[PDB]
Enzyme design. Structure first.
Site, PDB file in Angstrom:
ATOM      1  N   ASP A 210       0.424  -0.679  -0.226  1.00  0.00           N
ATOM      2  CA  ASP A 210       0.119  -0.198   0.389  1.00  0.00           C
ATOM      3  C   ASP A 210       1.298   1.366  -0.057  1.00  0.00           C
ATOM      4  OD1 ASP A 210      -2.000   1.563   0.293  1.00  0.00           O
ATOM      5  OD2 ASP A 210      -2.581   1.963   1.840  1.00  0.00           O
TER       6      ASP A 210
ATOM      7  N   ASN B 259       6.476 -10.395   7.708  1.00  0.00           N
ATOM      8  CA  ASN B 259       4.883 -10.184   8.603  1.00  0.00           C
ATOM      9  C   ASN B 259       4.585 -11.573   7.922  1.00  0.00           C
ATOM     10  OD1 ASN B 259       2.618 -10.380   7.303  1.00  0.00           O
ATOM     11  ND2 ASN B 259       2.399  -8.342   6.642  1.00  0.00           N
ATOM     12  N   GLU B 260       4.019 -12.033   9.452  1.00  0.00           N
ATOM     13  CA  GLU B 260       3.860 -13.658   9.262  1.00  0.00           C
ATOM     14  C   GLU B 260       2.498 -13.890   8.452  1.00  0.00           C
ATOM     15  OE1 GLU B 260       0.805 -14.052  13.016  1.00  0.00           O
ATOM     16  OE2 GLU B 260       1.970 -16.285  13.555  1.00  0.00           O
TER      17      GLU B 260
ATOM     18  N   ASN C  31      -0.366  -5.303  13.622  1.00  0.00           N
ATOM     19  CA  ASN C  31      -1.048  -4.237  13.119  1.00  0.00           C
ATOM     20  C   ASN C  31      -2.690  -4.203  13.355  1.00  0.00           C
ATOM     21  OD1 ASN C  31       1.612  -3.338  11.801  1.00  0.00           O
ATOM     22  ND2 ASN C  31       1.545  -4.638  10.586  1.00  0.00           N
TER      23      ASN C  31
ATOM     24  N   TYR D  93      -6.838  -3.000  12.531  1.00  0.00           N
ATOM     25  CA  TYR D  93      -7.552  -1.830  12.559  1.00  0.00           C
ATOM     26  C   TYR D  93      -9.087  -2.368  12.663  1.00  0.00           C
ATOM     27  CZ  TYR D  93      -3.733  -0.195   9.306  1.00  0.00           C
ATOM     28  OH  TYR D  93      -2.333   0.577   8.938  1.00  0.00           O
TER      29      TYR D  93
ATOM     30  N   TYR E 176     -11.008  -1.274   8.956  1.00  0.00           N
ATOM     31  CA  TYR E 176     -11.705  -2.963   8.463  1.00  0.00           C
ATOM     32  C   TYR E 176     -12.481  -3.854   9.080  1.00  0.00           C
ATOM     33  CZ  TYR E 176      -7.324  -0.373   5.481  1.00  0.00           C
ATOM     34  OH  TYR E 176      -6.818  -0.141   4.912  1.00  0.00           O
TER      35      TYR E 176
ATOM     36  N   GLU F   8       0.763  -0.727  13.626  1.00  0.00           N
ATOM     37  CA  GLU F   8      -0.019  -0.040  13.525  1.00  0.00           C
ATOM     38  C   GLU F   8      -1.834   0.349  14.160  1.00  0.00           C
ATOM     39  OE1 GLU F   8      -0.222  -1.245   9.196  1.00  0.00           O
ATOM     40  OE2 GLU F   8       2.038  -1.513   9.187  1.00  0.00           O
TER      41      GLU F   8
ATOM     42  N   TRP G 246       0.034   4.226  12.608  1.00  0.00           N
ATOM     43  CA  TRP G 246      -0.186   4.628  11.293  1.00  0.00           C
ATOM     44  C   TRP G 246      -1.028   5.509  11.101  1.00  0.00           C
ATOM     45  CZ3 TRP G 246       3.098   2.485   8.298  1.00  0.00           C
ATOM     46  CH2 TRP G 246       2.897   2.268   7.251  1.00  0.00           C
TER      47      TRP G 246
ATOM     48  N   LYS H 238      -4.254   8.505   6.593  1.00  0.00           N
ATOM     49  CA  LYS H 238      -4.587   7.565   7.796  1.00  0.00           C
ATOM     50  C   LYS H 238      -3.513   8.389   8.652  1.00  0.00           C
ATOM     51  CE  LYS H 238      -6.672   2.698   6.875  1.00  0.00           C
ATOM     52  NZ  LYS H 238      -6.188   3.103   5.956  1.00  0.00           N
TER      53      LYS H 238
HETATM   54  C1  LIG Z   1      -2.230  -5.669   8.195  1.00  0.00           C
HETATM   55  C2  LIG Z   1      -2.475  -3.905   7.912  1.00  0.00           C
HETATM   56  C3  LIG Z   1      -1.096  -3.522   6.599  1.00  0.00           C
HETATM   57  N1  LIG Z   1      -0.307  -2.343   6.638  1.00  0.00           N
HETATM   58  C4  LIG Z   1       0.044  -2.295   5.703  1.00  0.00           C
HETATM   59  C5  LIG Z   1       0.474  -0.732   5.802  1.00  0.00           C
HETATM   60  O1  LIG Z   1       1.299  -1.102   4.319  1.00  0.00           O
HETATM   61  C6  LIG Z   1      -0.939   0.253   4.956  1.00  0.00           C
HETATM   62  O2  LIG Z   1      -0.815   1.605   4.606  1.00  0.00           O
HETATM   63  C7  LIG Z   1      -2.131   0.328   5.947  1.00  0.00           C
HETATM   64  C8  LIG Z   1      -3.531   0.387   6.000  1.00  0.00           C
HETATM   65  O3  LIG Z   1      -3.091   2.040   5.845  1.00  0.00           O
HETATM   66  O4  LIG Z   1      -4.231  -0.203   5.192  1.00  0.00           O
HETATM   67  C9  LIG Z   1      -2.285  -1.588   6.175  1.00  0.00           C
END
Ligand SMILES: CCCN1C[C@@H](O)[C@H](O)[C@@H](C(=O)O)C1
Ligand SMILES: CCCN1C[C@@H](O)[C@H](O)[C@@H](C(=O)O)C1
Lengths: 571, 569
Positions: free
Chosen positions: A166, A397-398, A446, A448, A452, A486, A531, A550
């Site tokens: 991204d 990253n797993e 990370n 959200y 998300y 994040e 993030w 973000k």
């Molecule tokens: C699992 C989330 C991974 N994350 C990576 C980052 O590079 C993206 O910008 C971010 C996002 O804003 O979706 C998600």
């Protein structure tokens, strides 16, 4: 490595000349440069700033989105006095891969767009004359080099980068370029490792040089006074009443590495270092034996027009903003940054999680990918290990499913990191929702929940789901620190709503408040890196409104409402 | 001038080392730096990027708005081989005024924040050693230097700049800094002037050196092939089938100036030049004997965070934008720009009106005149050999005009004429009410913005035509160039019907202006205000600076940008 990662300096033994400025540049959509002798000079170039990403200068889509081979050229006068020196071109990076030519001769190639490229031009350099450098660069993405992606071919043959990540596929000569001269026997590498002994400290070191003459290592305090001196390519500097490098309260000694022969000094390398230890103990991250809670952001090398182009002004503004938020840490999401970022972190007492370009990604190819992943790891660690700011390596990253294959893959990466890091500092990566966490010294998540997952009207559900996951982690009792690397919401500056909506400034505040309530509910949480620090460019799409929003700051580095939320909390 | 304005180069005879990077920096609110040994090192500095304006890095108002004395310091290693050469510190600029110290020694001072400062450190330089440069800078505004303003003292003792101009008082080390080494006898200056002779051209030249040794001058074409060679500090290079530098179609020769000593060379200076003539003939501006109508913008050196800080990326983006609009010209409103802007205009075939920092303002006067003349002399000496530079913008006509004002401007124009080897067009901004001084007239007009804006735009158009009818009736037989016209326009502010500040109003305003421009034969150029939104002092009339940009500060087009593109195509 067949070259030195050491940052270039100028003194009696080492010389440097900046090649930054306007280079000649030419796109090569037909891939005809080499068969047309472009290594001897570009036939119809335009000017291109270096350092910069090339993309955002242009006014046409096909130039901005150019994917494939493209070439840079410049000329430089080499002082006659550089004769009999080892002369190198040093690129802060070449993104993503390239071959360096000098005076028409192929010198070296490199794949990996975010770490230095060193090209030994000793045998082709012409001291006392104008010299030429030409670089063939390619910015395609594939699955055998980092960061991964694909390269779509439109019906007319035009290439388009398709990232699996991204962020916009910026490329070119995004960092400073130097031509440098080193003594024929030079300091190639060194490593320091610290031990605290009451009021005193030990600086354990190793030095690698390109010859066999004796090495003397001195340590100077911040005023240039000698505090320790010893002899040998391995040794220990004893520092009485050491002034430790502390979070947001840096103190920097200067290590001075000398090679000598019977008639005097052959080389002198000097670098600022900070005496500090970092250790994980249970769920605590210990800096100089005291717990520290990480507060800050994932960033990017991203700025209007320049793209990822390095500029000290961006460093200066960003650090002023970071300090204003009361941050103490950033992660180099999702690639090692220009060296200057770390130098500055060292001065400002910021903690860095240094990340190889394998973290931010979302038949035969895997072994090659592993080779690239390990090479980037080796280069990153060799380059960055001596910064006191760098306290952890973010390596992976797993995958959503962990095969024995995948575990073996990551084991190799971590083993390589351990080998190259003289300090064996904490290693980490990004983990899925709940056999790789044994590889890590602490876990980064990370998440959200509220963006998300169950965003907006479902934010109460998001909080419950988040707590459910954290309760599962709690029940696992891993006894390691967890750092959120994040969490965030796309937020359009100026979009206000009452009640809040996803994308509004108010929702960003509310989302953060919810996340904090969750973080604070678990003892093992030891850090929060939001993030992102600032809005940044991504590939165009239906989910990206002029890049990623973000950011807590706008792309031009101004605070949204939520910036104050961090400031207040982190004070 | 007691120094050379020549851009630094590196070759066998001349050396250069960039001092750009992170310098040490310290504010000096109490004006105690020179009393406290700061010329030997700053006691509690922070890092400051160079080149950059310092203001926009900080997060506190008092730092951003700092006015007074402030200091820069850096250290640099000087190669031993520079020993006994003429060693100079060269600052692209020091804004606004300052004193340069090196190794603890006062070297020189300069007032005028937009032109190079040369400091001769030959006697204090330490070859083969670490050297230190410290600069005391001051950014106050007054009425004896350009650009003019006042300095307000808050009851606090804290100073605040009060410009008499509509741009933010950015300051610091805004341009690149070099340390350079020149031969003891060197090329200090040269001038070229052109004559067209059918398919051939003459490059008339003069060279000033710091010695008496013979000079050879060569001209190379774009591939480095020799096309002409002559001997002497003053001569003519004859160029067969000359490839002329043309508008938006540049061709650059390379002049090579050698000082010789028997069978060897003492110095070599090289610079790209373009063979072109600019002449005014009646109401026409002629480039290489063909009329050209100027199309473009007033700009600024202004960009987010960096302020006026120089960066090639800003040049590159701006030129790509300019080309996309089909522009051929810009004015360096309201101060000479970094040299690199002109170098690039030379490559891109853009025409430049080069402006001294007197034009942008809105017992002291004799001192002001000295400053104005000095800036004029420095600008012209610096910029004369750029083919892109086709005119000098030198003054702003005062409302009232006295016999003294006329004498003032006469001195400025006299200085300009003396220093410009090409005697190219000189101009300034004329009021609604010094024509013999100027080769052409510039008008800055805001009929439809400041006068009869919005619902009164039809009245604005009539008022505009009334003024132009008055100019017409004067029959001055000179070209008129509009150097400003525009409306503040907030990106994303849309309204139907349009309102002042909307994108639609900017379009309609421009259309009305064009209708007026096109009604008068003697109009010969239109440079819109401004290329891009830019920073100003805060106030109730400025919504984060000036929004008369056709582009946003981050260089993206408002609706009106397309209007220009289509018209200029
Ligand atoms: C699992 C989330 C991974 N994350 C990576 C980052 O590079 C993206 O910008 C971010 C996002 O804003 O979706 C998600
Ligand atoms: C006579 C010149 C007036 N003009 C100066 C320029 O610097 C300002 O930005 C502009 C304006 O937008 O008001 C007016």
């Amino acid at each position: 490595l067949e070259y030195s990662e050491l940052y270039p300096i100028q003194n009696e033994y080492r010389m440097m000349q900046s090649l930054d400025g306007m280079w000649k540049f030419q796109f090569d959509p037909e891939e005809i440069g080499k068969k047309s002798g472009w290594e001897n000079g570009l036939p119809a170039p335009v000017s291109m700033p270096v350092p910069s990403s090339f993309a955002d200068f242009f006014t046409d889509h096909k130039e901005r989105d150019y994917c494939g081979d493209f070439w840079y050229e410049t000329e430089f006068y080499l002082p006659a006095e550089w004769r009999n020196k080892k002369i190198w071109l040093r690129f802060g990076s070449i993104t993503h891969r390239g071959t360096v030519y000098c005076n028409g001769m192929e010198i070296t190639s490199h794949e990996g767009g975010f770490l230095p490229v060193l090209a030994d031009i000793s045998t082709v350099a012409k001291p006392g004359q104008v010299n030429q450098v030409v670089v063939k660069i390619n910015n395609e993405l594939n699955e055998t080099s980092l960061p991964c992606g694909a390269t779509k071919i439109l019906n007319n043959g035009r290439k388009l980068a398709k990232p699996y990540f991204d962020f916009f596929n910026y490329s070119g000569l995004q960092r400073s370029v130097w031509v440098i001269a080193l003594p024929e026997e030079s300091v190639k590498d060194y490593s320091v490792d610290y031990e605290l002994c009451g009021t005193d400290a030990l600086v354990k070191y190793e030095v690698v040089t390109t010859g066999e003459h004796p090495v003397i290592v001195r340590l100077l305090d911040a005023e240039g006074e000698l505090v320790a001196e010893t002899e040998g390519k391995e040794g220990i500097l004893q520092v009485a009443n050491a002034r430790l490098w502390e979070v947001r309260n840096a103190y920097l000694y200067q290590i001075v590495i000398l090679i000598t022969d019977g008639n005097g000094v052959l080389d002198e390398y000097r670098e600022k270092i900070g005496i500090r230890t970092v250790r994980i103990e249970g769920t605590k991250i210990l800096l100089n034996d005291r717990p520290v809670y990480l507060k800050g952001f994932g960033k990017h090398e991203d700025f209007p027009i320049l793209g990822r182009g390095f500029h000290w002004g961006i460093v200066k503004r960003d650090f002023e903003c970071l300090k204003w938020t009361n941050a103490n840490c950033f992660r180099t999401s999702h690639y090692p940054y220009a060296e200057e970022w770390y130098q500055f972190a060292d001065e400002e007492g910021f903690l860095i999680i240094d990340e190889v370009p394998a973290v931010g990604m979302m038949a035969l190819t895997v072994p090659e990918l592993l080779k690239s992943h390990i090479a980037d790891t080796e280069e990153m660690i060799t380059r960055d290990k001596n910064h006191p700011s760098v306290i952890a390596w973010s390596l992976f990253n797993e995958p959503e499913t962990i095969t024995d294959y995948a575990y073996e893959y990551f084991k190799e990466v971590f083993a390589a990191a351990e080998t190259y890091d003289f300090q064996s500092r904490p290693m980490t990566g990004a983990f899925e929702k709940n056999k790789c966490y044994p590889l890590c010294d602490f876990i980064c998540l990370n998440r959200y929940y509220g963006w998300y997952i169950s965003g907006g009207p479902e934010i109460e559900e998001a909080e419950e789901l988040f707590r459910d996951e954290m309760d599962r982690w709690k029940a696992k009792e891993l006894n390691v620190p967890f750092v959120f690397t994040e969490f965030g919401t796309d937020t359009m500056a100026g979009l206000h709503k009452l009640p809040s909506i996803m994308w509004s400034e108010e929702y960003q505040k509310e989302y953060l408040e919810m996340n904090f309530r969750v973080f604070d509910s678990y003892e093992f949480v030891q850090g929060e890196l939001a993030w992102n620090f600032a809005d940044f460019q991504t590939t165009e799409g239906i989910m990206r409104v002029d890049g990623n929003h973000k950011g807590v700051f706008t792309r031009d580095r101004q605070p949204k409402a939520a910036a104050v939320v961090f400031k207040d909390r982190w004070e």
